Write an enzyme that holds these catalytic residues in place. Structure first.
Site, PDB file in Angstrom:
ATOM      1  CG  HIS A  40      10.936  -9.461  -7.916  1.00  0.00           C
ATOM      2  ND1 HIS A  40       9.724 -10.381  -7.240  1.00  0.00           N
ATOM      3  CD2 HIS A  40      11.937  -9.336  -6.828  1.00  0.00           C
ATOM      4  CE1 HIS A  40      10.250 -10.390  -5.978  1.00  0.00           C
ATOM      5  NE2 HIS A  40      11.459  -9.789  -5.673  1.00  0.00           N
ATOM      6  CG  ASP A  84       7.308 -11.568  -9.051  1.00  0.00           C
ATOM      7  OD1 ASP A  84       8.163 -11.832  -9.635  1.00  0.00           O
ATOM      8  OD2 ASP A  84       7.389 -10.912  -7.987  1.00  0.00           O
ATOM      9  N   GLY A 175      15.017  -9.511   0.429  1.00  0.00           N
ATOM     10  CA  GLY A 175      15.642 -10.691   0.691  1.00  0.00           C
ATOM     11  C   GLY A 175      15.028 -11.946   0.814  1.00  0.00           C
ATOM     12  CB  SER A 177      12.712 -11.510  -3.356  1.00  0.00           C
ATOM     13  OG  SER A 177      12.146 -10.115  -3.158  1.00  0.00           O
ATOM     14  N   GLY A 178      10.928 -14.194  -3.503  1.00  0.00           N
ATOM     15  CA  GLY A 178      10.803 -15.717  -4.085  1.00  0.00           C
ATOM     16  C   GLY A 178      10.565 -16.649  -3.112  1.00  0.00           C
TER      17      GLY A 178
END
Ligand code: K73
Ligand code: CA
Length: 223
Positions: A40, A84, A175, A177-178
């Site tokens: 994402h 994801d 923020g 994320s990942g």
């Protein structure tokens, strides 16, 4: 990260910031040429920023390297965030040193109850918005799959796990994320999704990296 602490500069040397004019996602360095993040987080024009603490100040240990290729997992579903995970290849190899270092991939998954380290530059508030400029850290346990599925009925797959605190107060957030979830020295999770941040009965959901190690290794070797 809500309810965490300031990590300290370069104490999480595998943490990367993905920048497209601004920080927009975390990631994890897995060797000198490759970063793992969330699907994402996919977009064009990614610059990988290594060795960062304050993402708004050049402090002297950074490496900024453009991505040459991004590979979203073949089975990523953007509606459910199943699978994801994304790989990013650097245009040139990072110079590995004590502040820019890869994190090992799992040889097996982690079990419920294992304590992990989650880190990022995401929102630090559970209501409202405040974005830190230095890296924040959070110790959090992997939650049982049954408590995870009860929190999010219908929505958890075998490629996901929950971590955090059902009482709220401590969580990852937008923020982050990942970015990494590291447990006993292995990258076991990727910050993926959840309902709000640090709310009761709404823990964070993380991509279950151990399911993807074969795909990671073969993709890196063939690209
Ligand atoms: N506090 C943990 C946390 C940490 C980090 C985040 C950042 N992740 C998102 O923002 C994702 C991207 C797509 C939308 N997302 C969401 O979570 C949505 N609220 C829910 C959703 C939607 C579709 C499929 C699956 C889940 C969120 C919560
Ligand atoms: Ca910096």
């Amino acid at each position: 990260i809500v309810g965490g602490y300031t990590c300290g500069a370069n104490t999480v040397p595998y943490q990367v910031s993905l920048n497209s004019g601004y920080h927009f996602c975390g990631g994890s360095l897995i060797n000198s040429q490759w970063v793992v993040s969330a699907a994402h987080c996919y977009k064009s024009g990614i610059q990988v920023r290594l060795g960062e603490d304050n993402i708004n100040v050049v402090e002297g240990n950074e490496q900024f390297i453009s991505a040459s290729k991004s590979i979203v997992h073949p089975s990523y579903n953007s509606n459910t965030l199943n699978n994801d995970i994304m790989l990013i290849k650097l245009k040139s190899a990072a110079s590995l040193n004590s502040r820019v270092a890869s994190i090992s991939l799992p040889t097996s998954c982690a079990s419920a109850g294992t304590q992990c380290l989650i880190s990022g530059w995401g929102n630090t508030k559970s209501s409202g918005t405040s974005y830190p400029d230095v890296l924040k850290c959070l110790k959090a346990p992997i939650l049982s799959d049954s408590s995870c599925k009860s929190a999010y009925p219908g929505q958890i797959t075998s490629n996901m796990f929950c971590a955090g605190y059902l009482e709220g107060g401590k969580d990852s957030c937008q923020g982050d994320s990942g970015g990494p979830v590291v447990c006993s020295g292995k990258l076991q999770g990727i910050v993926s999704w959840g309902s709000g941040c640090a709310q009761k009965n709404k823990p964070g959901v993380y991509t279950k990296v151990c399911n993807y190690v074969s795909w990671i290794k073969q993709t890196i070797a063939s690209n």
